[PDB]
Structure formats: C-alpha cells, structure tokens
Symmetry: C4
Subunit: 388 residues, 4 copies
C-alpha cells in the first residue's frame, strides 16, 4: 500500500535464535532439489522467503557435474518458502542470470539478475515481476552485484554493483532505483579500495552495507548510504577482529581507512551489524578456509581500531563447512525495533569435497534475541559418502 | 477477525468416525515423503492441517538411517494439508526444532519450536509466522513442550513446558501467551508429580490437558487451566482404567492424587476427554508396548476412583503399531457444541521393526459422532519387507 | 453466495467434444501418480476438478500390489485439477473411505465417504470441508453410494445409497441433504428392482439418475427426483438398446418396468441423458467385457420400448479398456442451457491385464456440442509391457 | 475488469535482454518433467506463463519413445510459471489437443485446442476455463492453428487457422472471437499463397501476424488484421533477408507479393516485428536445418525489397539446436509503449539426435531493450549422452 520507511532502530542483540534451515543437501540426496549457491533471505510484507542462484539441474542429476562454476546460461535467481528446500516444483524464478539482488519496497518487489559472457554482461531490473530497466556492463569484466537483499526507503532502493578486476582497482557504482527506474547513480567514494558482494540493512533512514575487499583487505569495507540525499560514504571496519576469509591472524590494532594486509586476491561475502555497543560481526572460524562460523559482539567495531569481543556465539563448528553470509531483516514485523537477521550458506561438494562432481549448499539463518539464549551449532548435516 | 472464545460444551460422544488418515509410510515407499514423528492436528478458522516434526530427510533417502533419535539440528515443525502425506514439496515449515506446539487464536496462529543441545535449549514463539518471544532453558535438561495443539481463549493461549529430569522431579511451567508475548507464567501446582507432553482441549472457558507422568505414574496427570484468571490445578485421572504405556494391569481402584505405581521412567503421550458421563479415554491395547489403540467410555473417570468402561471402540488392532496420541477440535465449526477429535501416531521402523534403519510414522485421526457407528480398525498399512 | 437452482434445460446434443483427459497411467509409469479407481468429475462455481478413490500408494510403488480390491483402510476420495493426473503432491483429500459422492450447492461443497468393514460401514457427510452428519449401515452389507457427483437444487442435494445384497433385493434409500444435514430420507419406490452407483444430472428443477441393477437387469434403472417435493419415482430405460455390461445382445423390444433378463449378478456404473428426442445413452461396445465405449442417440429411450439409435459417436475403441462412466455438468457456465458432460474410467491392470499386480485407471471426459463434430477415439494410452 | 485495447506503439528495439529460460531438458534428466513441443509465452494482467503442447509422458518415462510424432490423443495445451520447467506437478492443462493458441482479453483468457484424426479434427474454444464454441474441420486435412498467443482488442481476439494441404493450396480462415463466441470469420485474402503457424502481436489497434508458407515460400507471409473493422490483408515480407527454414541463400532482392522460391514443402514457425525503421526479424542461422537463432534489424523489411541488416544479435549459436519461435508482449506492463518479446523453442532428441527415442524441447525468451546490451548465446544446455 505505502512505501516502507526505515523508521526504527535495531533491537538490542543479546544472542541469536534459529530462524530457518532448509537441510537442502540432506533432503536432495533422494528428492528433486535444485543445485544452488549464493543464497539469501528477503521478506515481503506478508511472507519471508529463501532466495538463491539455481544451477539449472538437480543435485542427483547428471548435469550437477561441473557446478563448481559460477557463471552459465543455466543459472537463475529463484525463491522458495522459508525453510523448505529449493525444489524443481516449489521454486519461483525471479529472473535469469548468475549474480542477483532483490528487495521489497512496501508496495512490490524489485529483483535484479545480471547475465552474459564476462566481457559483455548486463543487468535487468525487474519490478512487480516485469522487466523495467537494463544496464550494460561499463568495465567489461564480470558486472556483478550483492548476492543478498537490497534495502528500500520511501521507494528508493540503493544497490551496489562492481564491474572490473577482482584483483586490482575496479569500478563500483551505487544505483538508486525507484519502481525499477534509475533515479541516480554515483561512483564509489570514501576510503574503501575495492568492493564486492555488499550485505545491507536499514535502520533510522540510513542503509549500512558490509562488503568484501577482494583485492587487499582482510578487514571488511563498509558503505553507508543516505537513501533520501542519495549519497554515501565508505571506510573499513576499524576493529582488529578481522572478518574476511582467508585472512591473517587477528592483530591488536585494525585499519579504519585502508585494507588490512596479509592476504591478496581472495575473500568471502560476509556481513555485520554496526550499531555502537550493539555491534556484532560474523566470520568464519578458520583463517584459512570457509569452515565454521561465529558471531562476535565487538562494541564500536566500526570506529574503534582496538575493539575486541565482549560476547559471542558459535553458529557452525570449525569442523563443518560454511560459505557466503549476509544480512536481511523483516521490515514489516510488529514492535518498536528491527530485529537483525543473517543467513550462512553451507557449501557442500567441490572444491573441498571432491569425491562428488557437484557444488551446492544448504541454508541456515538466525535472528537476534533480547534474551541471552543457549547456543547450538547448525551444520549442513548431509553425508557426502551417500552421494558416491 | 476476533479472538476465539471457548463458549461451547463438548458434543455427546456416542462413537468415533474417521476424520483423516495420510497413509504416509505406504505412499513414501515410492515418493518423496519426509520422515517424521510426534505428529498432531490443528485447525485454523478456514482449514485443518496435519503437523509433525520432520527429520529433514525422506524415508527412502539414505539420511533416514539414524532417525530413531529424537533431537537433531535437522528437525522442524511442518504442516501440510489434511490427510495428504508430509512430502518435500507440500510441507510448510512453521519453525525449526525438535519439540513443538501450535494453535490458532481466531486471528492468527502461534507456533512454538524448541531447539538446542540438551543442556542449553531455547523455545522461540512465532506469531503470525514471525518470531516474537524467546525463552531460555531454566533447568538445563531438555526443555520440551506438548507435541500437540495448544488452545486459546480471548487471545490467551496457555502452553505447558517441562525442563529437567524425565526420571525424577522436574520443573514444569504453564506460560500464558497472547500475540506471542508472555502475559504470565506459573510453576506447576496441585498433586501431579511429573508432567510431559500435555494433550489439551477447551470448552466453556476452561482448558483441560491430559499429560504423561514419565517418572512414576501409569494413570495420567490432568492439568485444568482457567485462561481468564490465568490459574490452574492438577491431579490424576482417578479411574482404575490405566492409560499410560507401558503400565501394570488394571486394578479395581485408581489414585486421584498420586501416581499409580508399577512402572517407572517410561510412558507415551496420550489424551482424554473428561466431561462427566461423556468421558472417553484413549490407551494402547498392550500394557507392555505401543501396540493397538482403543477408546473407552469411562463415566466420571476424572473424579471416580472405581469407574470402569461402559462402552468402547477399537481404533488400531493389538497386532498393529501405535504411538503418541493427542487431542484437537475444530473450534470454528458450525453448530452448538465442540466435536471432540484425536489423532494416533502409527510408528513404523525402529525400535520394534529393526530390519529398517529408520523410524517414521503415519497418522490416523477420528472425531466423535452422536450416532453409535460401526467400528473398523485403522492400521498404518505399510509392508516393512518392501523397504528391505 | 446463493444456492444454485436448476433453472435451465439441456443444450441440444448433436455430438461430443473432448473436455478433459489425464493420461494418468502413461504419466505414472515414471512419476508419483496415485493408484485410483471409481473416478468422476464435479464442478464448483469457479473450477471443475477430477475426483476418484485413491488406493493410498503410487502405481510404481510396491504397495500397488493387491489394488484390484475395492475396499481397504487406505482409500480416500481425492480431487485434483482438471486433466492433471492424481499425484501424491497435487491431490486434495476430501474424506476417507471406499465409496463416495460430492457436489457443490452454489455456496459450498458436500462430500460423502463411506468406510468400515462390510458388516459395519458408515457414511460421513462433510460440508464446507468439515464433518457434519454420520449415517450407520442399515442392512450390514456394504453401505455404498454413487461414485459420481450428486446434484443440488436450492440447497437440497439428494443422494442415493444402497445397503444389502449385490445379488438379490437390497435396501436403497434416497437422502435429501442441505448444509450436510438430513432433511428427509425415503426408501426406493417405483419399479426398479435393484439400484447401485447412480449417475445423476439436474435440469428444470428435476434430477435424473441412471443406475446399475446388479441383480437381474441389463437395461438400466432410472430414478427421477423432485428436490422441492423431496419425492422420487423409478423405472427402467424402456429402450431395447441395452446399456449395462455384461449384457445379452440387443432385442427389438425392451422392458419399462422390469429388469431385461439374460445376465445376473454383475454390471458396471453407467449413465444416460434422457430428454425426449435429445436422448443419448452410453455403453461399452463389448457385450461381454468392459471394453470400448460409445454414445448412441436413442430418441425417447426412457419411454419408447422399441427406440433404436438415430446417431452415434465412438468414444473408446473395442480394442481398448473402459470401465465405470458417469454424468456431471458445469451448473455455473454462461448461457441459456446446461451442457451435458460425462467421463469414462479407463481401467488398466487386473483382472484383464494380469501381468501387473495392480489395478488403476485414467480418465477421459467429453461434453456435448450443438455442432456435428468429427470423432476420435480416446484410449488410456499406456503400454503395460513398460510396467514389467 | 475492462477489455484491453491496443493503444500503445512498440518500444524502440535497440537490443534484446534475457526474459525467461526453463532449462527443461537439463532438469528433466532427473525430475518429473513432461515431454513437450510447440511452446510459447502469454501474459495475463497479473502474471506471464510458459505454454506448450504436452505429449502426456515424462522425458525419462518409457512412454517418451515415439514422441517425435506431432498428433496423438495424449497431447494437451499446458501452462506453467514463467521459467519453471513443465512438470507433472506444476503444469495446468488448458484444454486437450495437438494444436493450440491462447490469449487474455483483459477480462479473462481464451484457449483453443484442436484434436481429432487427420480427416476429422475439431477446435474447442474455451473462455474463462470453460468450453464455449466448437468448430469442425472444413477441409478434412489437419485443421491447425497458431502454436503461439493470439491478440485481443476491445474483446475481439482474431485467430488464424488452416485446414488442407501442407504442400499445395489450403483453406485458411481468420476467426474473430469475443467471449469465446464467433463474431465473424473470413477466408484468407491478399497475396500470401499459403499460411501456417502465425505469430502475432498488436500495437495501435492493428494486429500483425508473421506466418510460415510451407508450400513454396522462404520469405514469410504477413497477415495484418484490423480487429475493429474485422478485416485483414496479406503479403510477404519484401526483404531479401529470408527467414524461413530450410531456405536458399539470401538474394539481393526479395518478393513482396509472391513466395520466394528455392525450397518447397517445408518450413518452421517464426516471427518478426515490422515497425518501419524499428523492424527486427528472427531466423535460424543455418539455411539447411533448425540450428542457431539470430535477430536482425532490417529497416522497413516489410515494404523494401532490397532491405538488408543494420544491426543484429545472436540468440543461439549455429552449433546449438533451435526450433519454432514466436512473438508475445506483456500488454499490461507499465509505461508508454509495448515491449516486443519472443521465445525460441530449443528442440532436443529426434530427428537430429537419434540416439534417444524421444523428442522434446526447452524454452528461451527475450524482450527488447532501449539500451544496446551485450549479447550472450542461450543453448538448451542438456547433454544427450546423459540420457543414454
Ligand atoms: C550455553 O550457551 C551459552 C550462550 O551461548 C554459552 O555461553 C557462551 O559461551 C561462549 C563460549 O565461551 C561465549 O563466547 C565467547 O565470548 C568471549 C568473550 O567473553 C569473554 O570476554 C569478555 C571480555 O573480556 C575483557 O573485558 C573484561 C571486563 O570488561 C575483562 O575482565 C577481561 O579480562 C577482558 O579484558 C568477558 O567480559 C566475558 O566474561 C563474562 O561472560 C562469561 C561467560 O562466557 C562469564 O564467565 C563472566 O563471568 C562474565 O560475565 C568472557 O570472559 C569471546 O572472546 C569468545 O571468542 C573468542 O574465542 C573463540 C574460541 O572460543 C574464537 O573462536 C573467537 O574468534 C574469539 O577468540 C579469537 O579472537 C580474539 C579477538 O581477536 C582473539 O583475542 C583470540 O586469541 C582468538 O583469536 C584466534 O582465533 C580466531 C578465530 O579462529 C582467529 O581469527 C585469530 O587469528 C586467532 O587465531 C567467544 O565468543 C559466549 O559469550 C557465552 N555467552 C553468554 C551469554 O555467556 C554457555 O557456554 C553454554 N553452556 C554450556 C554449558 O555449554
Ligand atoms: C459393529 O460396531 C459396533 C460399534 O463399534 C460394535 O459394538 C461394539 O462392540 C465393542 C466390542 O464388543 C464394544 O466395546 C466394548 O465395550 C465394553 C463395555 O460394554 C459392556 O459392558 C457394559 C457395562 O457393564 C457393566 O454395567 C452393566 C449395567 O450397567 C452390568 O449389566 C454389567 O454386568 C457391568 O457391571 C454393558 O453395559 C455393555 O452392554 C451393553 O452393550 C452391549 C454391546 O457391546 C449389548 O450387548 C448389551 O445388551 C448392552 O446394551 C457391555 O456388556 C468394554 O468393557 C470393552 O472394553 C474391554 O474389553 C476390551 C477387550 O474386548 C479391552 O481391550 C478393553 O481394555 C476393556 O477390557 C479391559 O479393561 C477393563 C477395565 O479395567 C477390564 O475390566 C478388563 O478385564 C480388560 O482388562 C484387560 O485388558 C486391558 C487392555 O489390554 C489391560 O490394560 C488390563 O490390564 C487387562 O489385561 C469394549 O470396549 C462396544 O461398546 C460396542 N459398541 C456399541 C455401540 O455397541 C459391534 O460389535 C460391531 N458389530 C460386529 C458384528 O462386529
Ligand atoms: C467423421 O466424424 C463423423 C461424426 O462422428 C462420422 O460420422 C458418424 O459416423 C458414425 C459411424 O458410421 C455414426 O454412428 C453410427 O450411427 C448409426 C445411426 O445412424 C444410421 O441410422 C440412422 C437411423 O436409421 C433408421 O431411420 C432412417 C430414417 O429415419 C431409415 O432410413 C433407416 O433405414 C433406419 O430405419 C440413419 O438416419 C442414419 O443416416 C443418416 O446419417 C448418415 C451418417 O452416418 C448419412 O450417411 C445418411 O445419409 C443420413 O443423414 C444412419 O444410417 C448407429 O446406428 C451406429 O450404431 C450402431 O452400429 C455400431 C457399429 O458401427 C455399434 O457399435 C452400435 O452399438 C450400433 O449398432 C448396434 O446396436 C443396434 C441397436 O440395438 C443394433 O441394431 C445393431 O445390430 C448393433 O448391435 C450389435 O452391436 C452392439 C454393440 O456391440 C451389441 O450390444 C448388440 O447386441 C449387437 O451385437 C453408429 O452409432 C455417426 O452417427 C455419424 N455421425 C454423423 C454426424 O454423421 C464420420 O464417419 C467421420 N468420417 C470419417 C471419414 O471417418
Ligand atoms: C558485445 O555485445 C555487442 C552487442 O551485441 C556486440 O556487438 C554486436 O556485434 C554483432 C556481431 O558483429 C553485430 O551483429 C551484426 O550486425 C551486422 C550489421 O552491422 C554492420 O553493418 C551495418 C550496415 O552496413 C551498411 O551501411 C553502412 C552505412 O549505413 C555502410 O557503411 C556499410 O558499408 C553497409 O552498406 C553497419 O552500420 C554496422 O556498423 C556499425 O556498428 C559496428 C558494430 O558491429 C561498428 O563497428 C561500426 O562503427 C558502426 O557503428 C556494421 O558494420 C549484421 O550485418 C550481422 O549479420 C550478418 O552476419 C552474421 C554473421 O556474423 C550472419 O549470421 C547474419 O545472417 C548476417 O549476414 C548474413 O546475411 C546478410 C544479409 O542477407 C548477408 O549479406 C551476409 O552475406 C550473410 O549471409 C550469409 O549467412 C546467412 C545466415 O547464415 C545466410 O542465410 C545467407 O544465405 C548467407 O549464407 C550481425 O547481425 C551487432 O549489431 C553488434 N551490436 C552493436 C550494438 O554493436 C559486440 O561484438 C560484443 N563484444 C564482444 C567483445 O564480443
Ligand atoms: C570443515 C573442515 O573440516 N574444516 C577444516 C578445519 O576443521 C581445520 F582443521 C583446517 F585446518 C582449517 O583450515 O582451519 O582445515 C579445514 C579444511 O580441512 C580445509 C582444507 O581442506
Ligand atoms: C480391450 C480388448 O482387447 N477387448 C476385447 C475385445 O476387443 C473383444 F475382442 C472381446 F472378445 C470382447 O469381449 O468383446 O474381448 C475383449 C477382451 O479380450 C475380454 C477378455 O479378455
Ligand atoms: C546444432 C548443429 O550441430 N547444427 C549443425 C550446424 O552447426 C552446421 F554445421 C550444419 F552444417 C548446417 O546444417 O548448417 O549442420 C547442422 C546439423 O549438423 C544438421 C545435420 O545434422
Ligand atoms: Ca579479502
Ligand atoms: Ca508413566
Ligand atoms: Ca446388470
Ligand atoms: Ca517455407
């Protein structure tokens, strides 16, 4: 009916409670579950759904061979009911492509899928499930976007894209859409030196995105967007609690305005909630690989270059595989505050488990509680030996 | 539109007619049916559905091995259309966990799932399909709840939980929720010495729950809740017709205010309708194992310590497997009275049928008739040899 | 919104056009299609659906063995979208049992399922998808009903039941329901000597049912019901064009008020439209077995004991299997007249094709045209050898 | 609510962006995907869907053997959600037959299916999902229609049919339907000598159809219909850019009013958008077989017998299989102009890939952009060796 406005602050995060989990790889061992990766969660005013990029084959299907590859003509953004698995029969295709974002503005949903060969990709922006706008590649090198939900305020839904090198300077743009049309775009500004796969959330008329500096940084760049002024800033999380992967060991002092060095030309999509003392960071447990996942309460991580954890919660054990992670909230919930949520992609198969010829994932997702809840760990749960 | 009020009495129960049956194990021999256990039935104002705890794998799936276990990260409360089986493609996840309850208040549904390791479990209370409240374990020993529907009156939906030992005193609480928020909770009072898995129904502004004393009692404890005053009482069914399992042979006199002794540290979820002469008790036929199921009309069972059956109906033959059973009613039906209903869980596989490596169930459910109807028996119907 | 009234006459039937066909046995060779038999079609004001009695297993499932049997605890009335097959995932259970009828009254649907052992069966009458009324067996010998849709007028939906012998006099009753409640019932009157499986249609405030005299008659009994007066009459179709199966060869003169003799203790559900010159009869082509199906225009068949065909249409070749057939119309269509429709059940498997251990069917259905359309034949289409 | 009127012109076509793709053959290797051919796309005011003719078996099913044949009793027009595959469980049958068209008039949808033996076929015209009108064969030789969407204006939906020889003069008629009823029909007029499988679109109260002259022409006939006057004209595309298949090499001058000769008794359904300088033609890349697909901008193709391409876009590489192609638009989109769209059928299996015994297809579909977007190619993507 009316466009949603970001009028609330974050609820106090004292722990994380289980929100959804689809067990897709367990179930897909013997049912028609699509191979996916790059999953996320996003809410409409009346429903919240799981999203991901299909690979256009089931996991048991012979076409699952080769699905380690990120980009093909067979990928599409799909959505499906919360905590069900992405099956052939219940998955709704939002648009065709191999990089995506999607968000609801309070009236209807915008979905964006990018497709094409590496040197000639284009984004199509869908609004109310019809294509409205198209954007051609500007740097001819894998035009790509968030892989988790965008955020809207009064109809304005900013979206971060990158086109150019994954291993040196690239051309990142912030587009401000409304009803699927471009109001404005700007080149990246501020002190973030490289941006990929931004994870975003909105509170009190500001949108905060935690991104991946693939080039040099093991601290995460942060873009903050004013969706009214349609302007932004960028920096890094100051905290020495480093949250990319792979990454070096944690130091005692981080960097606010430069990449924290040690690891080049690699990373993983991740996220954080940056809200003064109410600040929580996600990271893999392993510094070397996408294994384990934990949440750490790091008061003032964004601005305090010596901030260390005051509390934490393990999400996935270090003996279990993790993957991309990202933020979403139910902007249409009851109550006085927005409840922070996140998902973690649990990647199975190649390259770490190469006795199968496929790569897929399942999803686990949590939201914050004002209680101090007991923790469990939440592995994918599938036995790779069953697929042999 | 408005909250439902328990304004009607029970219809006269003169027999039981078949209401629903999903044949899940028969069908799941060759289709994508999820492994479940702890099923139940619950109605919305416009639909009634089957509910259960998924095990996050199909029955033919290789992950069905090990599903005798009650608690894993792969379980969730699911619902699906009445008398269909719980399949991968038609099952709707209500929330994630390994103990649950759910009920509709006339406006929308509350669902509660508990998850966690044994010493650190938490309940999440969902209302209008969003998480609202969380409750951490208080005794650090398998926080657990009804495994069948709760009941609401004017928006107040009491729920019984237990945390603590299954084989000695435990800490049982009655929470009174409204819109997913805690109005009040109380510790168990009265003469029931141990409470698990309460089966509840509502009539004339009172809610009656028939529970399982796992510790000492082969008679069933009964909690009666006034959802206006938000107060309760507890006792046992007085009747010598004993209704837990396993249990000793029936005596001639029961116990009103103490466990009837003979069997320790075991039991099964069960139910009854306690309404003066219109009183019917469910039980397994076998005193030793979860086989068979019958309904017995035991006038004044609750209050008369010498009451014996005046009528009965066999539901499941003693040569067929039964399991948990519980009560629900369609509070939104037409007419002057609430029609008592129940389900029986028909457990197949381990431990009684150990040539398969799984444990699952199907559901049969009946409601009362004012006629004296002919009886059939209603087995699960699957042939275990087909799964070998 | 308002109850439907039978205010229109039949459209002129000049031929039959294809309406629906599900190819269930072809498709079910390699997908999760339920075994059924006793199918039919029925319309709501906004949709028309296929109906049948499930056998509670898929066709490829190992539980399909033994499905020649008519009555088990695993059967249910299911419905599913027009011309789709009855699958595990798209079939909606209306009620549990092994004999059924269903019709919409303009406001909501009534469905009736009978279940039980042979000597102790009961009907449950569901209205607005809730059980309302129950009827116990009166003759203790397979209480059974139409196996095709009932018809309503101003909320009154008459239903024909039989209880008693299939091979001698039985006790047939016409119940007049409204909102699932019994307004009245009457014992069969008139000159029909035995009634089973009535096929009904309504026009100009009268309901006509064409039934099966299993005992002695190879002509079909006809019940005509006034749903306002709640009274009926019965006789036989006068025509020498005999329409039961098996049956003797056609004579030159039929019988109006007695069974036409020659074949005892057998028959098949069938139907006709009896409307003066606009009269069409269905029958199997074979006099000996359920093979082939044809429509014959037999002016005044009901009343003229020498009436012979003036036109016809082959529906199923004599080299293809047929089965039960029955009538329905879309009472909520546009226009000035009700368009006659019918289905034919195409039975596959046992007893005629005994290299498989199952029995199932698919459905073909046609409606009348005022054109003189070209005919095709419409076989089930499945290859039994594929199932070996 | 009101009938749609064709009040807009075409948007400027500067390139084509990906719209939908179902990957049906890849997915159907290991899931219950129906065999189809003759697919298309059509929109309702609130949804756009894929359509095709089922063959009434899954691809892995043993009944897929023999599905090279165009006409059987097992075919039906089905629809399913955009970019999902046509599965047993999500496909909605529109009507039964082996040639079809369908379109929405702004109020509800008309669907037309033709069935029958070759010498005795009939069309049934469905409106608001009920049969309304029937049309018997007039030339007794495979009555057949568009195999892609029709177009409506103020309730009038013209439809082109052909009955008669595929290899000499035939009898083509334009029927003008409204609410499923025949307002008028006319025989083909103008200079087109043979018409099959018209692909249509509407703009500014005129409907343009690009058809297939199977008899003599390798240029495509064009019918232009005034749906207010209910009159039409026909000619050929003048352009030497020849767009049927198979076809001779392109000359320098085409023919406006006669078939361009070179290839007899063959062709493929195809389409074009004819709008002065904004004119784009589809064709296979190969002159000999249904391989590859490209779009060429050929200003004034309809009227200029020397027009050559000024721009183009490859859709499918010449090393990949193509098939039928056709036009549709979303008439209910926002904005000032109608966005041209098309699909291409990607045929797999027989006759070109005869190591499998089946023939099926997947779908790819694009719509126009006012940007000059980078191109990719969009193959079916399935590996035939996996099906062996
Ligand atoms: C039932 O469930 C409940 C609820 O979940 C469970 O309770 C939870 O238990 C977990 C596990 O213990 C806790 O998570 C950890 O939290 C600590 C932070 O809390 C500690 O420190 C606080 C701050 O201390 C500072 O200030 C205070 C005064 O302000 C001062 O006293 C102190 O000296 C210091 O200067 C303390 O306030 C806090 O105490 C409070 O809480 C206690 C309960 O935990 C209670 O006992 C106290 O009385 C008091 O109330 C407490 O001491 C996190 O630091 C920790 O995270 C580190 O460790 C894990 C490994 O366990 C690691 O994975 C993390 O990455 C992180 O450590 C790495 O990073 C650091 C920062 O750079 C670095 O310093 C470390 O060396 C280490 O780095 C290495 O590994 C990383 C990752 O691989 C790598 O990248 C690096 O390169 C390097 O190799 C955990 O998050 C929960 O907070 C707690 N929750 C609650 C509500 O209590 C309960 O256990 C369950 N019950 C059962 C029976 O199972
Ligand atoms: C078509 O369908 C219809 C409808 O379903 C079928 O009819 C049904 O038939 C069934 C099976 O017979 C009946 O169920 C049983 O009901 C009896 C209760 O009814 C009897 O007793 C009544 C009360 O008697 C007392 O009062 C009267 C006067 O008030 C006095 O005369 C009498 O002496 C006594 O003091 C009688 O009123 C009643 O008579 C009436 O109804 C008759 C019809 O049944 C009719 O003939 C009469 O004229 C009159 O109208 C009748 O006599 C239940 O007692 C019984 O349940 C016990 O038995 C089964 C085994 O069959 C068992 O599983 C139960 O658990 C239970 O027995 C155990 O528990 C007892 C209590 O503690 C204990 O005392 C027993 O020793 C036994 O305990 C052992 O086993 C248990 C369980 O394993 C274990 O835990 C213990 O430790 C121990 O080992 C049945 O429920 C239906 O009521 C009846 N329904 C109707 C409407 O009629 C019909 O059969 C079908 N037709 C066909 C052709 O198949
Ligand atoms: C394209 O499609 C079109 C449309 O579908 C196809 O045209 C259709 O063609 C079929 C097949 O031919 C026709 O079906 C048959 O219809 C006849 C009835 O029509 C005939 O008889 C009419 C009445 O005759 C009487 O009155 C007139 C004057 O009023 C008088 O002249 C006459 O002597 C007699 O006294 C005639 O009016 C009618 O003529 C009209 O139509 C003609 C077109 O057909 C046209 O040529 C004429 O000029 C004129 O306009 C015509 O002669 C049915 O009788 C017949 O059904 C019998 O036969 C089939 C076997 O074919 C059988 O299965 C049936 O059960 C039935 O025969 C059995 O039952 C009889 C009754 O008891 C019994 O008498 C028989 O001995 C036989 O009994 C045996 O078998 C049964 C069953 O196994 C068993 O139970 C018994 O015991 C015993 O063993 C067909 O239904 C369509 O009507 C026709 N439709 C149209 C609109 O034309 C066209 O063919 C297709 N084109 C192509 C190229 O394929
Ligand atoms: C990133 O993506 C972008 C966007 O997709 C990619 O850029 C696209 O690149 C493709 C491939 O190159 C282009 O498609 C072709 O377009 C040409 C038409 O454009 C050319 O000609 C125009 C008209 O020329 C005439 O007028 C001008 C002045 O008005 C005059 O100068 C000239 O001499 C002539 O008289 C030129 O205007 C145009 O130039 C413009 O654009 C250029 C970019 O392309 C730029 O460089 C220029 O500066 C200027 O701005 C350009 O020269 C089509 O002709 C062509 O289609 C033919 O060729 C393909 C094979 O490639 C074939 O399949 C087609 O069927 C067709 O050729 C057949 O048919 C002809 C007509 O009958 C016949 O003449 C031919 O002999 C041939 O016939 C044979 O094959 C067929 C089919 O098998 C058979 O039936 C016959 O019998 C016979 O055997 C392509 O469609 C895109 O237009 C271009 N898009 C854009 C926006 O730029 C970019 O490449 C990608 N980047 C990367 C890095 O990959
Ligand atoms: C899930 C898992 O086993 N993660 C381990 C993790 O438990 C650690 F032991 C680790 F050494 C690590 O990289 O931290 O290796 C991970 C993994 O073996 C990477 C190379 O294959
Ligand atoms: C479908 C079919 O083959 N029907 C034939 C039919 O074609 C006839 F040849 C028949 F002899 C018949 O009963 O009429 O036999 C039927 C069948 O063989 C019954 C005994 O098995
Ligand atoms: C898809 C494909 O391989 N198309 C080729 C295509 O690449 C060409 F090489 C062609 F020679 C052609 O017909 O143009 O043959 C097609 C095909 O082999 C037809 C006879 O089998
Ligand atoms: Ca990095
Ligand atoms: Ca006990
Ligand atoms: Ca008979
Ligand atoms: Ca041609």
């Amino acid at each position: 009916r009316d466009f949603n406005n970001l009028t609330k602050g974050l609820c106090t995060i004292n722990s994380w409670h289980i929100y959804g989990k689809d067990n897709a790889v367990r179930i897909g061992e013997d049912s028609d579950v699509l191979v996916t990766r790059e999953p996320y969660v996003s809410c409409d005013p009346d429903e919240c759904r799981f999203y991901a990029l299909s690979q256009g084959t089931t996991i048991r299907g012979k076409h699952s061979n080769g699905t380690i590859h990120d980009r093909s003509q067979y990928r599409a953004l799909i959505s499906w009911p919360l905590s069900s698995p992405p099956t052939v029969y219940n998955s709704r295709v939002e648009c065709i492509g191999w990089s995506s974002t999607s968000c609801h503005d309070g009236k209807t949903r915008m979905s964006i899928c990018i497709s094409g060969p590496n040197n000639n990709a284009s984004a199509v922006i869908w609004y109310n499930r019809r294509p409205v706008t198209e954007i051609n590649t500007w740097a001819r090198n894998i035009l790509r976007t968030q892989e988790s939900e965008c955020v809207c305020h009064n109809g304005v839904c900013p979206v971060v894209f990158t086109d150019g090198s994954a291993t040196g300077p690239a051309e990142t743009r912030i587009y401000y859409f409304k009803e699927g049309k471009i109001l404005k775009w700007e080149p990246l500004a501020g002190t973030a030196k490289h941006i990929e796969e931004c994870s975003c959330y909105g509170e009190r008329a500001e949108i905060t995105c935690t991104c991946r500096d693939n080039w040099q940084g093991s601290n995460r760049p942060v873009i903050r967007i004013d969706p009214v002024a349609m302007t932004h800033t960028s920096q890094y999380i100051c905290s020495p609690v480093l949250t990319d992967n792979p990454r070096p060991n944690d130091p005692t002092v981080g960097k606010c305005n430069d990449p924290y060095p040690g690891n080049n030309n690699n990373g993983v999509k991740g996220f954080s909630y940056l809200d003064g003392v109410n600040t929580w960071l996600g990271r893999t447990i392993s510094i070397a690989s996408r294994s384990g996942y934990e949440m750490l309460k790091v008061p003032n991580a964004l601005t305090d270059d010596k901030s260390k954890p005051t509390q934490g919660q393990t999400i996935v054990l270090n003996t279990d595989w993790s993957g991309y992670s990202g933020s979403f909230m139910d902007y249409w919930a009851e109550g006085e505050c927005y409840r922070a949520c996140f998902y973690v992609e649990l990647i199975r198969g190649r390259p770490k488990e190469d006795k199968v010829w496929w790569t897929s994932n399942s999803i686990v997702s949590m939201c914050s509680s004002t209680e101090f809840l007991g923790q469990w760990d939440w592995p994918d749960g599938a036995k790779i030996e069953y697929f042999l």
